[PDB]
Amino acid sequence: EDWDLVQTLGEGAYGEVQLAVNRVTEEAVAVKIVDMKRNIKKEICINKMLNHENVVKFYGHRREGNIQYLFLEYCSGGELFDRIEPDIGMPEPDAQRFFHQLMAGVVYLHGIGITHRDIKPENLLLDERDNLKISDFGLATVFRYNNRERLLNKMCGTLPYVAPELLKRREFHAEPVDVWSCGIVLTAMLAGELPWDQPSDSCQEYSDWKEKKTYLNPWKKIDSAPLALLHKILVENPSARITIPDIKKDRWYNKPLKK
Ligand SMILES: Nc1ncnc2n[nH]cc12
Incomplete structure (x- = not known):
């Protein structure tokens, strides 16, 4: 009481x-x-x-x-x-468990038509068993209601995590932004740095990535399997971007790593 x-x-x-x-x-x-x-x-x-x-x-x-x-x-x-x-991240089996539950949550939300719009490590909290929880739906909204999607047009989130089309388009689908921010968490998780300040043509590090120069500072630290999955997530045209059910089929995701 x-x-x-x-x-x-x-x-x-x-x-x-x-x-x-x-x-x-x-x-x-x-x-x-x-x-x-x-x-x-x-x-x-x-x-x-x-x-x-x-x-x-x-x-x-x-x-x-x-x-x-x-x-x-x-x-x-x-x-x-x-x-x-910083600059190292965490053990690659610890990354996978956390990315599993990120996917459990985003699937669960996407299931009920809500999008969080601000997935970043600061908004993933861990309980006594280090079990991940999505937190703060302050910028979250309904994007599917009565089984009709509504397109988003409001810009928001945190730049380095935000999806390229949240800055070049006027309307955009809620789920692929969410697919994009979870991959920036994968990349934080495996490298200990964020790839670019914002997913921009004006931004050198994102220009490189799209040019596939993967011998550069964060990607070099990431193993070929999880980096294969990140090449599928951080696709610039959100229509070709891997969807969550495909993430669930991917080689890295289904790889046995942790006891
Ligand atoms: N910042 C926070 N720390 C711990 N538990 C929490 N729950 N909701 C927000 C939290």
């Missing part, structure tokens, strides 16, 4: 997220704190559509004044971001 607020979790633009601990049951939860006067509805009513074990569980919302209280899953292992050591 009453929730002690133990320590901060992430001081976001919205306000802050805090660890919260139940005085009787000792169960720990996280309370994102939206002071509307210093959008938050859609994020709430999206949260009521969600129920999966690779997505932050949503509990309820105390409506005190304008200080909206978002009662969400505690992820005690924090951010996939803090398990990528």
Whole structure:
């Protein structure tokens, strides 16, 4: 019934997220704190559509004044971001497990017609068993409803992760952006650096990639199998881009790596 607020979790633009601990049951939860006067509805009513074990569980919302209280899953292992050591990344079996559950979640969401629009290691939280959870549907929206897709036109996300067509086109399909950002997480995961600042013609590193100069700083660190899969994801024409069911068929993905 009453929730002690133990320590901060992430001081976001919205306000802050805090660890919260139940005085009787000792169960720990996280309370994102939206002071509307210093959008938050859609994020709430999206949260009521969600129920999966690779997505932050949503509990309820105390409506005190304008200080909206978002009662969400505690992820005690924090951010996939803090398990990528710079310029090296992590062990290739650890990458695969995390990319498996990224795919479990994106499939699950895409299944119900919602797109996250901001997949990046900062938005993948890990529980006590390092089990990955997709977090913060603040920029997430409906793109399929009554089994009719709606095209996106609003630009958003985080540049280095964002898909090329979110910058050259006026309308674009929600799922291939999501296919593109998860591959930038694959690449972070395996190299420990991001390939380019933004997927642009004006950007040297993305020009190289499209020219297939794969003897250059992040790709050289990536094994031929996962790099074969990244050549399929980070395709510039989102119509030829590998779709999630094809990702599920790929050689690397189905390779036995971890006990
Ligand atoms: N930043 C955060 N740290 C831990 N658990 C969380 N859940 N939702 C956001 C979180």
